Coordinates of all heavy atoms in Angstrom, one line a residue:
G5 N 98.6 316.5 119.8 CA 98.5 317.8 119.6 C 99.4 318.4 118.6 O 99.1 319.4 118.0
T6 N 100.5 317.7 118.4 CA 101.5 318.1 117.4 C 101.4 317.4 116.1 O 101.7 317.9 115.0 CB 102.9 318.0 117.9 OG1 103.0 318.7 119.1 CG2 103.9 318.5 116.9
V7 N 100.8 316.2 116.2 CA 100.6 315.3 115.0 C 99.6 316.0 114.0 O 99.8 315.8 112.8 CB 100.0 313.9 115.4 CG1 99.8 313.1 114.2 CG2 101.0 313.2 116.4
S8 N 98.6 316.6 114.6 CA 97.6 317.3 113.7 C 98.2 318.4 112.9 O 97.7 318.8 111.9 CB 96.5 317.8 114.6 OG 95.5 316.8 114.8
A9 N 99.4 319.0 113.4 CA 100.1 320.0 112.8 C 100.4 319.7 111.3 O 100.2 320.5 110.4 CB 101.3 320.4 113.5
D10 N 100.9 318.4 111.1 CA 101.2 318.0 109.8 C 100.0 317.6 109.0 O 100.0 317.6 107.8 CB 102.2 316.8 109.9 CG 101.5 315.6 110.6 OD1 100.5 315.1 110.1 OD2 102.1 315.2 111.7
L11 N 98.9 317.3 109.7 CA 97.7 316.9 109.0 C 97.0 318.2 108.5 O 96.1 318.0 107.6 CB 96.8 316.2 110.0 CG 95.3 316.1 109.6 CD1 95.1 315.2 108.4 CD2 94.5 315.4 110.7
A12 N 97.2 319.3 109.1 CA 96.7 320.6 108.6 C 96.7 320.7 107.1 O 95.7 320.8 106.4 CB 97.3 321.8 109.3
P13 N 98.0 320.7 106.6 CA 98.2 320.9 105.1 C 97.8 319.6 104.4 O 97.8 319.6 103.1 CB 99.7 321.0 105.1 CG 100.3 320.4 106.3 CD 99.2 320.6 107.4
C14 N 97.4 318.6 105.1 CA 97.0 317.3 104.4 C 95.5 317.2 104.4 O 94.9 316.5 103.6 CB 97.5 316.1 105.2 SG 99.3 316.0 105.2
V15 N 94.8 318.1 105.2 CA 93.4 318.1 105.2 C 92.8 318.6 103.8 O 91.8 318.1 103.4 CB 92.8 319.0 106.3 CG1 91.3 319.1 106.3 CG2 93.3 318.5 107.7
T16 N 93.5 319.6 103.2 CA 93.1 320.1 101.9 C 92.8 319.0 100.9 O 91.8 319.0 100.2 CB 94.1 321.2 101.4 OG1 93.7 321.5 100.1 CG2 95.5 320.5 101.4
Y17 N 93.8 318.1 100.9 CA 93.7 317.0 99.9 C 92.7 316.0 100.4 O 92.1 315.2 99.5 CB 95.1 316.3 99.8 CG 95.1 315.0 99.0 CD1 94.7 314.9 97.7 CD2 95.4 313.8 99.7 CE1 94.6 313.8 97.0 CE2 95.3 312.6 99.0 CZ 95.0 312.6 97.7 OH 94.9 311.4 97.0
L18 N 92.5 315.9 101.7 CA 91.5 314.9 102.2 C 90.1 315.3 101.8 O 89.2 314.5 101.8 CB 91.7 314.9 103.7 CG 92.9 314.1 104.3 CD1 93.1 314.5 105.7 CD2 92.7 312.6 104.1
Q19 N 89.9 316.6 101.5 CA 88.6 317.1 101.1 C 88.5 317.3 99.6 O 87.4 317.5 99.0 CB 88.3 318.4 101.8 CG 89.3 319.5 101.6 CD 89.1 320.7 102.4 OE1 89.1 321.9 101.8 NE2 88.8 320.6 103.7
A20 N 89.6 317.1 98.9 CA 89.7 317.3 97.4 C 89.3 316.0 96.8 O 89.4 314.9 97.4 CB 91.1 317.7 97.0
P21 N 88.9 316.1 95.5 CA 88.6 314.9 94.7 C 89.8 314.0 94.4 O 90.9 314.3 94.6 CB 88.1 315.5 93.3 CG 88.8 316.9 93.3 CD 88.9 317.3 94.7
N22 N 89.5 312.8 93.8 CA 90.5 311.9 93.5 C 91.4 312.4 92.4 O 92.5 311.9 92.2 CB 89.9 310.6 93.0 CG 89.6 309.6 94.1 OD1 89.0 309.9 95.2 ND2 90.2 308.4 94.0
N23 N 91.0 313.5 91.7 CA 91.8 314.1 90.6 C 92.8 315.0 91.2 O 93.8 315.4 90.5 CB 90.9 314.8 89.7 CG 91.6 315.3 88.4 OD1 92.6 314.6 88.0 ND2 91.1 316.4 87.8
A24 N 92.6 315.4 92.5 CA 93.6 316.3 93.2 C 94.8 315.6 93.6 O 94.8 314.3 93.8 CB 92.9 317.0 94.3
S25 N 95.9 316.3 93.8 CA 97.2 315.8 94.2 C 97.6 316.3 95.6 O 97.1 317.3 96.1 CB 98.3 316.1 93.2 OG 98.4 315.1 92.2
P26 N 98.5 315.5 96.2 CA 99.0 315.9 97.6 C 99.9 317.1 97.5 O 100.7 317.3 96.6 CB 99.7 314.6 98.1 CG 99.4 313.6 97.0 CD 99.1 314.3 95.7
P27 N 99.9 317.9 98.6 CA 100.9 319.0 98.7 C 102.3 318.7 99.2 O 102.4 317.9 100.1 CB 100.2 319.9 99.8 CG 99.1 319.1 100.3 CD 99.2 317.7 99.8
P28 N 103.3 319.2 98.6 CA 104.7 319.0 98.9 C 105.0 319.1 100.4 O 105.6 318.3 101.0 CB 105.4 320.1 98.1 CG 104.5 320.5 97.0 CD 103.1 320.2 97.5
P29 N 104.4 320.1 101.0 CA 104.6 320.4 102.4 C 103.9 319.3 103.3 O 104.4 319.1 104.4 CB 103.9 321.8 102.7 CG 103.8 322.4 101.3 CD 103.6 321.2 100.3
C30 N 102.9 318.8 102.7 CA 102.1 317.7 103.5 C 102.9 316.4 103.5 O 103.1 315.9 104.6 CB 100.8 317.5 102.8 SG 99.9 316.0 103.3
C31 N 103.3 316.0 102.3 CA 104.1 314.7 102.2 C 105.3 314.7 103.2 O 105.5 313.7 103.8 CB 104.6 314.5 100.8 SG 103.2 314.3 99.6
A32 N 106.0 315.9 103.2 CA 107.1 316.0 104.1 C 106.8 315.6 105.5 O 107.5 314.8 106.2 CB 107.7 317.4 104.1
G33 N 105.7 316.1 106.0 CA 105.2 315.7 107.4 C 105.3 314.3 107.6 O 105.8 313.8 108.7
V34 N 104.8 313.5 106.7 CA 104.8 312.0 106.9 C 106.1 311.5 107.1 O 106.3 310.7 108.0 CB 104.2 311.3 105.6 CG1 104.4 309.8 105.7 CG2 102.7 311.7 105.4
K35 N 107.2 311.9 106.4 CA 108.5 311.5 106.5 C 109.1 312.0 107.9 O 109.9 311.3 108.5 CB 109.4 312.0 105.4 CG 108.9 311.7 104.0 CD 109.2 312.7 103.0 CE 108.4 312.5 101.7 NZ 109.0 311.5 100.8

Side-chain angles (χ1 to χ4, degrees):
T6 305
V7 178
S8 272
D10 61 62
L11 164 64
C14 295
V15 177
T16 173
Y17 168 64
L18 287 164
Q19 56 183 231
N22 270 54
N23 190 30
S25 270
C30 165
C31 297
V34 172
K35 303 150 196 280

